């Protein structure tokens, strides 16, 4: 269960009771749109909002894994691969063994957290997830940083793993669609936002749900 | 969080291998258990896994990592890196593409150095252990280039992470000892040669003091 596939949009919507009878269609049927559910927008706002996670409030307050990965991407932003790789290898080796110390990253955090490029990112994003996404995107200015290199993350932190895997994708997994939409909104607004900006997640979920035909049993099952 | 390799004492409890060791036997050995030698033999025998019987008969994971290691034995880093790059990328998405190994398995399976390994090892696990050890004559090939194996095949992950190590994890002590035994005899052996794993488990269990709670349970 630490290693399941990402939920598809339809599976996400069923897992969180987000499907409804679509009464715009059920009172005004549109040709080429039959046998499709609608989405409960209010409940989806809640769900996407709860994916956003904690506000950024100093790197020392981050999770151990977010801390140590931020340090790597910092080190890369600042063009220091051996600090970056060294953290990658220690976490790799201790992943083979029982549990890792992310504490290997502390010296690199200390050295780069107040650096110009890191301070630009933190200025411009308000959530841990959206800070670190932007930190990954800047570290890929240096070169190659695939999610490969921190494969160990998926069982530790499913959400963080999916957020970081969608950096560079155009469409995110439904389980990180909230912070991804918010990250983009921050980027479009040119500032950090503490107010959740997750509407694009809802619109995309609606659309993805509209592309899937239900059976009649399934249509009657909608409330 | 992450599933840790069992210690010797946990391995021993999990397979019900501890036994009351009699009041007709050692100072400094108060509160220790003995081992059921027969039952441990059967557990280590079962860890050996299947006989090697053609590369087409291996699991998809074993097939592809074997293909990687052969490629390195024959010094084609690129086709080895391509496979690994491709299984990384691909595991990160829904399911890794083991089929990418197929071409590589076809090109080097009958090559001199692979044939020498296959000749000398009777088990899949002992074959691929030796394929990995030989792949390291080319360069560094850590289990860090195949982190994904840990959840796909735990046994194989543990076997391959033990190549280079002097003491194995208990969960692969059988095929580790067999592998050493075959390298020592200079031939493949179909009869399990797993006594070293029994002797190591006994030594390790004797270093661990039990509580009065745990001693009361022994037979």
Residue numbers in the entry:
A (entry chain B): 157 to 379
B (entry chain A): 158 to 182, 186 to 379
Question: What did the article's authors report about this structure?
Answer:
The T4BS secretion coupling complex of L. pneumophila comprises the inner membrane AAA+ ATPase DotL (IcmO) and two inner membrane/cytoplasmic components, DotM (IcmP) and DotN (IcmJ). In this study, we determine the crystal structure of the cytoplasmic domain of DotM and observe large patches of basic residues, leading us to hypothesize that DotM might form the recruiting platform for Glu-rich motif-containing effectors.
Further binding studies were conducted with several DotM mutants, where Arg residues (single or double) on the protein’s surface were mutated to Glu. Five mutants were produced: R196E/R197E (termed “M1”), R314E/R315E (termed “M2”), R347E/R348E (termed “M3”), R217E (termed “M4”), and R262E (termed “M5”). To ascertain that the observed binding deficiency in M1, M2, and M4 variant proteins was not due to folding defects caused by the mutations, these three proteins were crystallized and their structures were determined and shown to be virtually identical to the wild-type protein. The final model suggests that CegC3 is primarily helical. Binding is observed between the main middle Glu-rich helical motif of CegC3 (residues E155, E158, and E159; see numbering in Table 2 and interactions in Fig. 5) to the “central patch” residues R314 and R315, as well as between R217 of DotM to peptide residue E162. Remarkably (given that acidic Glu-rich motif-containing effectors represent only a subset of Legionella effectors), the M1 and M4 mutations resulted in a significant decrease in L. pneumophila replication in the macrophages (up to 70–80%). However, in A. castellanii, M1 reduces intracellular growth by up to 90% (after 24 h) while the slight reduction in intracellular growth of the M4 mutant is not statistically significant. We observed that the M1 and M4 dotM mutants producing the reporter fusions Cya-CegC3Cter, Cya-OSSCter, or Cya-Lpg1663Cter displayed lower levels of effector translocation compared to the wild-type strain of L. pneumophila (Cya-CegC3Cter: 50% and 30% decrease compared to wild-type DotM for M1 and M4, respectively; Cya-OSSCter: 50% and 40% decrease compared to wild-type DotM for M1 and M4, respectively; Cya-Lpg1663Cter: 60% and 55% decrease compared to wild-type DotM for M1 and M4, respectively).
